[PDB]
Short mmCIF file of C-alpha atoms and ligand atoms in Angstrom, two decimals:
data_model
loop_
_atom_site.label_atom_id
_atom_site.label_comp_id
_atom_site.label_asym_id
_atom_site.label_seq_id
_atom_site.Cartn_x
_atom_site.Cartn_y
_atom_site.Cartn_z
CA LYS Z 1 -8.21 -16.41 -21.60
CA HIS Z 2 -4.62 -16.91 -19.89
CA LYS Z 3 -3.26 -20.25 -21.26
CA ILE Z 4 -0.06 -20.91 -19.50
CA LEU Z 5 -1.04 -19.63 -15.79
CA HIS Z 6 -3.93 -22.73 -16.16
CA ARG Z 7 -1.95 -25.44 -17.49
CA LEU Z 8 0.73 -24.69 -14.34
CA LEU Z 9 -1.71 -24.30 -12.13
CA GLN Z 10 -2.98 -28.38 -12.85
CA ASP Z 11 0.54 -30.08 -12.40
CA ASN M 1 0.56 -23.18 15.18
CA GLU M 2 -2.73 -24.36 13.73
CA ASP M 3 -4.18 -24.08 10.67
CA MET M 4 -0.89 -21.45 9.30
CA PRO M 5 1.97 -23.32 10.41
CA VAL M 6 5.08 -20.58 9.64
CA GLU M 7 6.95 -23.84 9.04
CA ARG M 8 4.80 -24.70 5.93
CA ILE M 9 5.16 -21.31 4.45
CA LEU M 10 9.03 -21.19 5.13
CA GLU M 11 9.36 -24.48 3.57
CA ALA M 12 7.76 -22.82 0.58
CA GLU M 13 10.29 -20.72 0.71
CA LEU M 14 12.69 -22.59 0.76
CA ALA M 15 11.46 -24.92 -1.65
CA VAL M 16 11.63 -22.14 -4.21
CA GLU M 17 15.26 -21.00 -3.53
CA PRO M 18 17.07 -20.47 -6.61
CA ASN M 19 24.47 -6.25 -21.98
CA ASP M 20 20.31 -4.27 -21.87
CA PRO M 21 19.71 -3.94 -17.46
CA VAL M 22 15.87 -4.05 -18.82
CA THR M 23 16.42 -6.96 -20.40
CA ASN M 24 17.77 -9.42 -18.80
CA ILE M 25 15.38 -8.28 -15.39
CA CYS M 26 12.55 -9.19 -17.86
CA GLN M 27 14.22 -12.66 -18.81
CA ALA M 28 14.41 -12.96 -14.93
CA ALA M 29 11.09 -12.02 -14.64
CA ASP M 30 9.40 -14.89 -17.05
CA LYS M 31 11.11 -17.33 -15.60
CA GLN M 32 10.41 -16.58 -11.86
CA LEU M 33 6.59 -16.67 -13.10
CA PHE M 34 6.49 -20.30 -13.31
CA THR M 35 8.36 -20.95 -9.86
CA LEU M 36 6.36 -18.30 -7.91
CA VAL M 37 3.30 -20.71 -9.25
CA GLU M 38 5.08 -23.58 -7.60
CA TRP M 39 5.55 -21.58 -4.12
CA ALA M 40 1.87 -20.68 -3.86
CA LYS M 41 0.41 -24.72 -4.44
CA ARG M 42 2.90 -25.31 -1.64
CA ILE M 43 0.73 -22.63 0.37
CA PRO M 44 -1.25 -23.86 2.70
CA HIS M 45 -4.56 -24.21 1.80
CA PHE M 46 -4.43 -21.70 -1.54
CA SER M 47 -4.21 -25.14 -3.89
CA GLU M 48 -7.34 -26.19 -2.31
CA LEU M 49 -9.31 -22.36 -3.54
CA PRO M 50 -11.15 -23.00 -7.03
CA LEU M 51 -8.93 -22.47 -10.16
CA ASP M 52 -10.68 -19.68 -11.30
CA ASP M 53 -10.06 -17.32 -8.10
CA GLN M 54 -6.36 -18.84 -7.87
CA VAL M 55 -5.93 -17.51 -11.25
CA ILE M 56 -7.34 -13.72 -9.74
CA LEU M 57 -5.02 -14.28 -6.37
CA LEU M 58 -2.15 -14.51 -8.79
CA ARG M 59 -2.58 -11.90 -11.58
CA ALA M 60 -3.35 -9.24 -8.42
CA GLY M 61 -0.50 -9.98 -6.76
CA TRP M 62 2.73 -11.37 -9.36
CA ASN M 63 4.58 -8.05 -8.76
CA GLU M 64 4.51 -7.51 -5.28
CA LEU M 65 5.41 -11.11 -4.57
CA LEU M 66 7.87 -11.08 -6.89
CA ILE M 67 9.29 -7.70 -5.97
CA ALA M 68 9.59 -8.50 -2.24
CA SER M 69 10.96 -11.89 -3.08
CA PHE M 70 14.31 -10.17 -4.86
CA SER M 71 14.30 -8.12 -2.75
CA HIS M 72 15.19 -10.16 0.52
CA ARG M 73 17.60 -11.48 -2.21
CA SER M 74 19.26 -8.47 -2.14
CA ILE M 75 19.83 -7.81 1.64
CA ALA M 76 23.62 -9.34 1.01
CA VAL M 77 24.35 -7.20 -2.36
CA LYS M 78 25.91 -3.83 -1.66
CA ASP M 79 24.00 -1.40 -4.08
CA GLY M 80 22.04 -3.49 -6.55
CA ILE M 81 19.71 -6.60 -6.62
CA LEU M 82 21.08 -10.31 -7.47
CA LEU M 83 18.79 -11.46 -10.62
CA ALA M 84 17.20 -15.29 -10.21
CA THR M 85 19.23 -16.03 -13.04
CA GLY M 86 22.65 -15.26 -11.42
CA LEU M 87 23.35 -11.79 -12.76
CA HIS M 88 23.45 -8.64 -10.46
CA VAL M 89 22.41 -5.59 -11.84
CA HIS M 90 23.97 -2.46 -10.00
CA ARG M 91 22.20 0.87 -9.22
CA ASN M 92 24.62 2.52 -11.84
CA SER M 93 23.63 -0.23 -14.63
CA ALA M 94 19.93 0.31 -13.80
CA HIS M 95 20.28 4.46 -14.03
CA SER M 96 22.15 3.66 -17.38
CA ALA M 97 18.85 2.42 -18.75
CA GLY M 98 16.64 4.64 -17.74
CA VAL M 99 14.88 3.02 -14.64
CA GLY M 100 16.83 4.46 -11.77
CA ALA M 101 14.23 5.98 -10.44
CA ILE M 102 12.33 2.74 -9.58
CA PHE M 103 14.98 0.84 -8.77
CA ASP M 104 16.40 3.62 -6.24
CA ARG M 105 12.76 3.09 -4.69
CA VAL M 106 13.18 -0.65 -4.40
CA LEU M 107 16.58 -0.23 -2.70
CA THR M 108 15.76 2.42 -0.40
CA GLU M 109 12.14 1.47 0.46
CA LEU M 110 12.60 -1.87 0.47
CA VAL M 111 16.14 -3.57 0.20
CA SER M 112 17.45 -1.27 3.35
CA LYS M 113 14.38 -1.52 5.15
CA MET M 114 14.39 -5.70 4.64
CA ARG M 115 18.52 -5.69 5.58
CA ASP M 116 18.01 -3.29 8.48
CA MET M 117 15.43 -5.07 10.55
CA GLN M 118 16.92 -8.02 9.42
CA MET M 119 13.82 -10.16 7.95
CA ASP M 120 13.74 -13.60 8.24
CA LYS M 121 12.33 -15.80 5.28
CA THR M 122 9.71 -16.93 7.26
CA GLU M 123 8.38 -13.54 7.56
CA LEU M 124 9.10 -13.01 4.39
CA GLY M 125 6.84 -15.99 3.39
CA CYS M 126 4.30 -14.39 5.77
CA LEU M 127 4.24 -10.92 4.00
CA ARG M 128 3.88 -12.41 0.56
CA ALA M 129 1.05 -14.88 2.09
CA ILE M 130 -0.94 -11.98 2.99
CA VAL M 131 -0.39 -10.56 -0.46
CA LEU M 132 -1.21 -13.55 -1.58
CA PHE M 133 -4.59 -13.51 0.42
CA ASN M 134 -6.07 -10.46 -1.19
CA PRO M 135 -9.34 -10.27 -0.83
CA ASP M 136 -10.00 -6.92 -2.42
CA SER M 137 -9.08 -8.52 -5.71
CA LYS M 138 -11.94 -7.98 -8.48
CA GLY M 139 -13.91 -10.95 -9.45
CA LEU M 140 -13.45 -13.33 -6.35
CA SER M 141 -16.34 -15.60 -6.06
CA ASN M 142 -15.67 -16.16 -2.42
CA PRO M 143 -13.81 -13.16 -0.57
CA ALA M 144 -14.62 -14.02 2.64
CA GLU M 145 -12.55 -16.99 2.79
CA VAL M 146 -9.87 -15.25 1.37
CA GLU M 147 -9.91 -13.14 4.13
CA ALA M 148 -10.26 -15.58 6.72
CA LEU M 149 -7.08 -17.37 5.63
CA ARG M 150 -5.05 -13.86 5.33
CA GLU M 151 -6.60 -13.38 9.07
CA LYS M 152 -4.25 -17.15 9.23
CA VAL M 153 -1.51 -15.77 7.90
CA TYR M 154 -1.09 -12.51 9.94
CA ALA M 155 -2.46 -14.36 13.39
CA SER M 156 0.52 -16.87 12.77
CA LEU M 157 2.86 -13.91 11.91
CA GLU M 158 2.43 -12.07 15.12
CA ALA M 159 2.80 -15.19 16.70
CA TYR M 160 5.94 -15.50 15.54
CA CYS M 161 7.11 -12.36 15.96
CA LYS M 162 6.34 -12.79 19.93
CA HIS M 163 7.96 -15.60 20.29
CA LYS M 164 11.16 -15.37 18.11
CA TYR M 165 11.96 -11.46 18.60
CA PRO M 166 10.66 -10.47 22.16
CA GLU M 167 12.72 -7.88 22.51
CA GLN M 168 11.14 -6.26 19.62
CA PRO M 169 7.71 -5.12 20.27
CA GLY M 170 7.11 -3.81 17.49
CA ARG M 171 8.22 -5.88 15.00
CA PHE M 172 4.56 -7.63 13.88
CA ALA M 173 4.17 -3.79 13.11
CA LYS M 174 6.98 -3.06 11.22
CA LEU M 175 6.67 -5.92 9.00
CA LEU M 176 3.10 -4.86 7.98
CA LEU M 177 4.25 -1.42 6.85
CA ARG M 178 6.12 -1.96 3.78
CA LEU M 179 3.19 -3.56 2.51
CA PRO M 180 1.69 0.11 0.94
CA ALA M 181 5.23 0.71 -0.25
CA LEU M 182 5.47 -2.73 -2.12
CA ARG M 183 2.32 -2.12 -3.03
CA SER M 184 2.99 1.44 -4.59
CA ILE M 185 6.57 0.06 -6.02
CA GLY M 186 4.66 -2.65 -7.53
CA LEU M 187 1.96 -0.40 -9.55
CA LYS M 188 4.79 1.87 -10.31
CA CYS M 189 6.87 -1.28 -11.73
CA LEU M 190 3.61 -2.27 -13.54
CA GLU M 191 3.42 0.69 -15.84
CA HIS M 192 7.30 0.34 -16.83
CA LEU M 193 6.64 -3.15 -18.30
CA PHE M 194 3.68 -1.92 -19.66
CA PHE M 195 5.80 0.98 -21.62
CA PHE M 196 8.20 -1.57 -22.90
CA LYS M 197 5.41 -4.08 -24.10
CA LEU M 198 3.77 -0.71 -26.01
CA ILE M 199 6.93 0.37 -27.30
CA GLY M 200 8.16 -3.16 -28.37
CA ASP M 201 11.59 -2.47 -27.92
CA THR M 202 11.85 -5.02 -25.28
CA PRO M 203 11.98 -8.47 -25.81
CA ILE M 204 9.37 -10.13 -23.46
CA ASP M 205 8.95 -14.25 -23.43
CA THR M 206 5.46 -16.21 -22.68
CA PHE M 207 4.69 -15.83 -19.41
CA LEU M 208 5.47 -12.53 -18.48
CA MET M 209 3.33 -11.03 -21.80
CA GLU M 210 0.60 -13.32 -20.89
CA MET M 211 0.14 -11.28 -17.48
CA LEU M 212 1.00 -8.50 -19.43
CA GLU M 213 -2.48 -8.91 -20.60
CA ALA M 214 -6.09 -7.50 -20.11
CA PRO M 215 -8.27 -9.27 -17.38
CA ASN K 1 1.58 6.42 25.48
CA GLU K 2 2.63 9.16 27.32
CA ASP K 3 4.94 10.53 24.30
CA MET K 4 2.11 9.87 21.77
CA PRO K 5 -1.38 10.44 23.52
CA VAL K 6 -4.01 8.42 21.17
CA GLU K 7 -6.08 10.95 23.35
CA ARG K 8 -4.51 14.30 21.62
CA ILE K 9 -4.75 12.29 18.08
CA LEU K 10 -8.31 11.94 18.52
CA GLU K 11 -8.99 15.68 19.31
CA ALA K 12 -6.85 16.79 16.60
CA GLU K 13 -10.20 14.83 14.52
CA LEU K 14 -12.82 15.79 16.49
CA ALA K 15 -11.08 19.97 16.45
CA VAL K 16 -11.38 19.90 12.37
CA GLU K 17 -14.69 17.74 11.94
CA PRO K 18 -16.36 19.24 9.02
CA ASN K 19 -23.56 20.52 -10.88
CA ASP K 20 -21.18 18.34 -12.07
CA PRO K 21 -20.02 15.50 -9.50
CA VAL K 22 -16.48 15.83 -10.48
CA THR K 23 -16.78 19.43 -9.71
CA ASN K 24 -18.56 19.15 -6.53
CA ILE K 25 -16.27 16.54 -5.23
CA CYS K 26 -13.04 19.10 -6.45
CA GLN K 27 -14.43 21.78 -4.49
CA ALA K 28 -14.70 19.55 -1.22
CA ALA K 29 -10.84 18.04 -1.89
CA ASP K 30 -9.84 21.84 -2.22
CA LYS K 31 -12.33 22.84 1.30
CA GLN K 32 -10.73 20.06 2.81
CA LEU K 33 -6.29 20.91 2.25
CA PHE K 34 -6.61 23.80 4.62
CA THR K 35 -7.88 21.72 7.33
CA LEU K 36 -5.75 18.59 6.37
CA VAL K 37 -3.40 21.74 7.72
CA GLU K 38 -4.68 22.21 10.52
CA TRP K 39 -5.12 18.81 11.58
CA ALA K 40 -1.67 18.41 10.83
CA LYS K 41 -0.67 21.22 12.96
CA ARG K 42 -2.18 19.81 16.12
CA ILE K 43 -0.73 15.92 15.79
CA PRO K 44 1.06 15.84 18.11
CA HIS K 45 5.37 16.82 17.30
CA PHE K 46 4.47 17.10 13.49
CA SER K 47 4.85 20.77 14.09
CA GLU K 48 8.42 20.30 15.73
CA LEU K 49 9.81 19.21 12.14
CA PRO K 50 11.85 21.63 10.31
CA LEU K 51 9.30 23.68 8.05
CA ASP K 52 11.11 21.81 4.82
CA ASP K 53 9.85 18.03 6.73
CA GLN K 54 6.52 19.55 6.45
CA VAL K 55 5.91 20.21 3.55
CA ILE K 56 7.09 17.08 1.83
CA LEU K 57 5.23 15.01 4.14
CA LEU K 58 1.85 16.85 3.56
CA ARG K 59 2.82 16.76 -0.30
CA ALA K 60 2.88 13.35 -0.39
CA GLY K 61 0.31 12.27 2.36
CA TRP K 62 -2.94 13.95 1.21
CA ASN K 63 -4.38 12.32 -1.22
CA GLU K 64 -4.26 9.25 1.05
CA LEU K 65 -5.18 11.70 4.17
CA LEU K 66 -7.97 12.71 2.46
CA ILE K 67 -9.24 9.63 1.26
CA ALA K 68 -9.37 8.15 4.47
CA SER K 69 -11.33 11.13 5.77
CA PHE K 70 -14.30 11.05 3.89
CA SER K 71 -14.56 7.09 4.03
CA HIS K 72 -15.22 7.26 7.68
CA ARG K 73 -17.28 9.98 7.48
CA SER K 74 -19.59 8.28 4.81
CA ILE K 75 -20.19 5.46 7.01
CA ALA K 76 -23.16 5.98 8.26
CA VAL K 77 -24.02 6.65 4.20
CA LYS K 78 -25.76 4.13 2.24
CA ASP K 79 -24.11 4.32 -1.51
CA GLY K 80 -22.03 6.95 -1.68
CA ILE K 81 -19.77 9.51 0.36
CA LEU K 82 -20.61 12.42 2.23
CA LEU K 83 -18.53 15.54 0.87
CA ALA K 84 -17.06 17.80 3.46
CA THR K 85 -19.41 20.59 1.64
CA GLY K 86 -22.33 18.81 2.88
CA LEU K 87 -23.45 16.95 -0.06
CA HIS K 88 -24.03 13.19 -0.60
CA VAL K 89 -22.65 12.05 -3.50
CA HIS K 90 -24.61 8.64 -5.15
CA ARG K 91 -22.20 6.36 -6.70
CA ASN K 92 -24.42 6.75 -9.67
CA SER K 93 -23.71 10.09 -9.71
CA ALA K 94 -20.29 8.61 -9.91
CA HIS K 95 -20.83 6.44 -12.51
CA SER K 96 -22.99 8.77 -14.14
CA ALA K 97 -19.75 11.32 -14.48
CA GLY K 98 -17.32 8.33 -15.81
CA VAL K 99 -15.25 8.62 -12.29
CA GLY K 100 -17.23 5.06 -11.03
CA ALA K 101 -14.61 3.03 -11.03
CA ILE K 102 -12.16 4.39 -8.33
CA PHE K 103 -15.77 5.50 -6.93
CA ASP K 104 -16.56 1.86 -6.24
CA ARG K 105 -13.10 0.86 -5.02
CA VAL K 106 -13.51 3.65 -1.94
CA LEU K 107 -16.83 1.90 -1.25
CA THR K 108 -15.86 -1.51 -1.70
CA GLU K 109 -12.12 -1.51 -0.39
CA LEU K 110 -12.28 1.62 2.46
CA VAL K 111 -16.18 2.35 3.57
CA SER K 112 -17.30 -1.43 3.43
CA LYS K 113 -14.63 -2.26 5.60
CA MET K 114 -14.85 0.65 7.68
CA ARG K 115 -18.68 0.08 8.10
CA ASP K 116 -18.08 -3.91 8.71
CA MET K 117 -15.41 -3.52 11.86
CA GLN K 118 -16.68 -0.11 12.58
CA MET K 119 -13.33 1.80 12.89
CA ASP K 120 -14.15 4.15 15.51
CA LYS K 121 -12.68 8.10 15.49
CA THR K 122 -9.37 7.66 17.29
CA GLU K 123 -8.39 4.46 15.04
CA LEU K 124 -8.49 6.80 12.10
CA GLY K 125 -6.70 9.37 13.53
CA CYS K 126 -4.14 6.93 14.23
CA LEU K 127 -3.79 5.60 10.47
CA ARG K 128 -4.02 9.16 9.61
CA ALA K 129 -1.22 9.47 11.78
CA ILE K 130 1.06 6.51 10.57
CA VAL K 131 0.23 7.65 6.85
CA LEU K 132 1.22 11.84 8.13
CA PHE K 133 4.50 10.41 9.37
CA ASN K 134 6.20 8.44 5.98
CA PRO K 135 9.55 7.99 6.39
CA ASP K 136 9.77 6.87 2.60
CA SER K 137 8.75 10.62 1.72
CA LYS K 138 11.55 11.59 -0.77
CA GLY K 139 13.96 14.46 0.27
CA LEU K 140 12.86 14.32 4.02
CA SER K 141 16.07 16.12 6.01
CA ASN K 142 15.62 13.48 8.96
CA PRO K 143 14.31 10.23 7.59
CA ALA K 144 15.09 8.45 11.21
CA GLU K 145 13.15 11.23 12.69
CA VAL K 146 9.69 10.81 10.73
CA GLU K 147 10.21 6.99 11.33
CA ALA K 148 10.55 7.29 15.28
CA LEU K 149 7.41 9.35 15.27
CA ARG K 150 5.63 6.36 13.13
CA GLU K 151 6.57 3.49 15.45
CA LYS K 152 5.05 6.24 18.60
CA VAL K 153 1.82 5.94 16.17
CA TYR K 154 1.39 2.59 16.21
CA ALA K 155 2.43 1.65 19.29
CA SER K 156 0.06 4.02 20.73
CA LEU K 157 -2.33 2.05 18.50
CA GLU K 158 -1.74 -1.17 19.34
CA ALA K 159 -2.14 -0.69 22.73
CA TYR K 160 -6.02 1.27 22.42
CA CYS K 161 -6.96 -1.98 20.16
CA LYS K 162 -5.54 -4.46 22.91
CA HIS K 163 -7.18 -2.21 25.59
CA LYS K 164 -10.53 -1.03 24.24
CA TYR K 165 -10.98 -4.10 21.70
CA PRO K 166 -9.67 -7.28 24.37
CA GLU K 167 -11.90 -9.46 22.64
CA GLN K 168 -10.78 -8.87 18.89
CA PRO K 169 -6.77 -9.78 18.76
CA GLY K 170 -7.03 -9.99 15.30
CA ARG K 171 -7.97 -5.83 14.91
CA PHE K 172 -4.51 -3.54 15.32
CA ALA K 173 -3.00 -5.32 11.59
CA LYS K 174 -6.29 -5.48 10.67
CA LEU K 175 -6.19 -1.83 10.88
CA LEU K 176 -2.77 -1.77 9.39
CA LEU K 177 -3.63 -3.62 6.29
CA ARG K 178 -6.01 -0.83 4.85
CA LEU K 179 -2.95 0.97 3.59
CA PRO K 180 -2.23 -0.93 0.48
CA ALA K 181 -6.17 -0.67 0.15
CA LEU K 182 -5.30 3.29 0.52
CA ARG K 183 -2.24 3.91 -1.10
CA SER K 184 -3.24 2.05 -4.02
CA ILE K 185 -6.50 4.04 -3.99
CA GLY K 186 -4.54 7.38 -3.72
CA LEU K 187 -2.07 7.06 -6.98
CA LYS K 188 -4.98 6.02 -8.93
CA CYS K 189 -6.96 9.56 -7.66
CA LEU K 190 -3.82 11.13 -8.47
CA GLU K 191 -3.78 9.95 -11.91
CA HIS K 192 -7.18 11.26 -11.91
CA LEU K 193 -6.48 14.40 -10.76
CA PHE K 194 -3.99 15.50 -13.32
CA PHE K 195 -5.57 14.28 -16.15
CA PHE K 196 -8.68 16.73 -15.14
CA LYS K 197 -6.20 19.48 -14.57
CA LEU K 198 -4.06 18.37 -18.56
CA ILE K 199 -7.47 18.25 -19.98
CA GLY K 200 -8.86 21.54 -18.34
CA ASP K 201 -12.46 21.33 -18.35
CA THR K 202 -12.89 21.29 -14.45
CA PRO K 203 -12.80 24.09 -12.19
CA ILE K 204 -9.75 23.67 -9.68
CA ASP K 205 -9.25 26.10 -6.82
CA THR K 206 -5.62 27.01 -5.90
CA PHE K 207 -4.54 24.79 -3.48
CA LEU K 208 -5.76 21.69 -5.13
CA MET K 209 -3.68 23.05 -8.29
CA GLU K 210 -0.66 23.97 -6.12
CA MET K 211 -0.84 20.15 -4.54
CA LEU K 212 -0.76 19.20 -8.44
CA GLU K 213 2.20 20.64 -9.14
CA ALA K 214 5.66 18.80 -10.05
CA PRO K 215 7.65 18.89 -6.90
CA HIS C 1 4.40 25.76 -3.12
CA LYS C 2 3.64 29.64 -1.99
CA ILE C 3 0.23 28.37 0.20
CA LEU C 4 0.81 25.49 2.05
CA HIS C 5 4.39 27.86 3.42
CA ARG C 6 2.24 30.37 4.49
CA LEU C 7 -0.68 28.00 5.89
CA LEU C 8 1.92 25.80 8.01
CA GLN C 9 4.10 28.86 9.35
CA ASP C 10 1.06 30.33 11.43
C1 LIG X 301 10.68 -1.49 -14.45
SI1 LIG X 301 12.45 -2.52 -14.29
C2 LIG X 301 13.73 -3.38 -15.57
C3 LIG X 301 13.40 -2.11 -12.79
SI2 LIG X 301 12.87 -3.33 -11.04
C4 LIG X 301 11.69 -2.32 -9.77
C5 LIG X 301 14.14 -4.19 -10.73
C6 LIG X 301 11.88 -4.40 -12.09
C7 LIG X 301 11.14 -6.03 -11.60
C8 LIG X 301 10.27 -6.05 -12.24
C9 LIG X 301 10.27 -8.09 -11.77
C10 LIG X 301 10.94 -8.74 -11.33
C11 LIG X 301 12.34 -8.99 -11.19
C12 LIG X 301 13.49 -9.32 -11.43
C13 LIG X 301 13.03 -11.23 -10.85
C14 LIG X 301 13.91 -12.01 -10.22
O1 LIG X 301 13.91 -12.74 -8.91
O2 LIG X 301 15.00 -12.02 -10.56
C15 LIG X 301 11.78 -11.24 -10.13
C16 LIG X 301 10.44 -10.35 -10.71
O3 LIG X 301 9.58 -7.44 -10.38
C17 LIG X 301 7.81 -7.49 -11.01
C18 LIG X 301 7.85 -8.20 -12.45
O4 LIG X 301 9.06 -8.38 -12.67
C19 LIG X 301 10.44 -6.57 -13.66
C20 LIG X 301 10.90 -5.29 -14.44
C21 LIG X 301 11.28 -4.75 -14.10
C1 LIG X 302 -11.59 11.01 -9.04
SI1 LIG X 302 -12.47 11.77 -7.98
C2 LIG X 302 -13.56 12.61 -8.79
C3 LIG X 302 -13.88 10.14 -7.53
SI2 LIG X 302 -12.95 10.13 -5.65
C4 LIG X 302 -11.98 8.76 -5.01
C5 LIG X 302 -14.79 10.23 -3.99
C6 LIG X 302 -11.98 11.42 -5.01
C7 LIG X 302 -11.26 12.16 -4.16
C8 LIG X 302 -10.45 13.08 -4.30
C9 LIG X 302 -10.49 14.01 -2.95
C10 LIG X 302 -10.85 14.20 -1.83
C11 LIG X 302 -10.68 14.79 -0.65
C12 LIG X 302 -11.49 15.27 0.42
C13 LIG X 302 -13.29 15.35 -0.18
C14 LIG X 302 -13.84 15.66 0.88
O1 LIG X 302 -15.23 15.41 0.47
O2 LIG X 302 -14.04 15.86 2.24
C15 LIG X 302 -13.60 15.22 -1.39
C16 LIG X 302 -12.48 14.25 -1.97
O3 LIG X 302 -9.29 12.80 -2.09
C17 LIG X 302 -8.09 12.87 -3.11
C18 LIG X 302 -7.62 14.19 -3.73
O4 LIG X 302 -9.41 14.59 -3.37
C19 LIG X 302 -10.82 14.15 -5.25
C20 LIG X 302 -11.31 13.45 -6.26
C21 LIG X 302 -12.16 12.45 -6.43
#
């Protein structure tokens, strides 16, 4: 479920 | 300029300012995806949208958003593009790699038409913000708020063009009318990327690979 | 509005006012290619272009031009499209024929949006006229000539918008922003037709077949 | 493109 994009959208 | 100030969109644009040609462009694409998130975050009211909606908007727009970026960055160079890595990719270099048709489409339809009208960074950001706030995106929980945020961007953009360039009344419409071309180029660009992956003849980094995998 | 009158564009729109579901839609698509030529001629200054450029524009635009025409025709119908052949095609007929995805896109991104802003027949005409004068079309003898004509159409459109809808300031830009939807749907629409031709279990008429052949 | 040319001429 696309990890990297979510992690970067936090901070 | 109230809810969508052109100064903040310009600040987002200025805050992100940076052997096998196909390998090099791909390295640069993965690189730019990271800094595209940082850009999106700095766009007024984007960060306030739910996380799942934010994901959809980037997954739907990344191609167009990044294509507009490297194009405007290339108005300076004569026959090619300046990659964010610092390398230059010339027409001939791209043709020799069997991607001449699409590279030419970028040059004549975007870079040239940007250069011709001397599109500024504010106008660049606004168009990119309009692309980002795409209410047609499948899955959007609240598409009306994304629809309203787009209207906020282009009301600001027209205001700016009337203010900054009163001499050219058709300039606002001129900017909007590069978006179908940007859309068209974006899709054809997506195709190529899928093919490189399918064949696997080309190294594709983790972020790029992630954006190329089904919803 | 004296060099590109909105009244004449509207006259051009009024002059052409009209068992497998996929087969029926294709038959209409052929019928509509003939009358598309008649429409194009009645658009100011189109006929004055060299014959070779008249061909290029129509080969590049027939998809988006025809899609825009039937979408607007289908605002009155509830959950499907009004074909020019008189038949009403419901979204379930479409889905149960395997083309449910692209059909829904037309309903959502085009028909819905046309209904919700009550896009009139003059605005349709102008948008179609903008699409027709596509300067990006490869092969065009004089691209700047086509570029000039595009500018006259949208200038006359904004003048129509600011005049007959003074309460809605963002309508002109709202109109122009259905064009990337139109372009995106246009290409996926073309991708299907090629497949129907390739597999060859859908009768395709001569004019439709001629439009579907490599440049 | 036979048909198109014929249709655009007249
Ligand atoms: C098929 Si291609 C080898 C010919 Si192409 C139209 C030049 C191109 C552009 C992309 C890129 C991209 C490129 C460069 C940057 C950068 O700023 O450095 C950012 C993104 O745009 C969409 C996604 O990635 C990727 C691949 C290819
Ligand atoms: C893949 Si499809 C079976 C799903 Si569809 C998006 C509904 C569609 C539309 C087309 C049409 C077309 C044009 C005009 C009419 C008309 O009746 O006026 C009807 C269809 O648009 C582009 C070319 O021809 C053709 C095929 C398909």
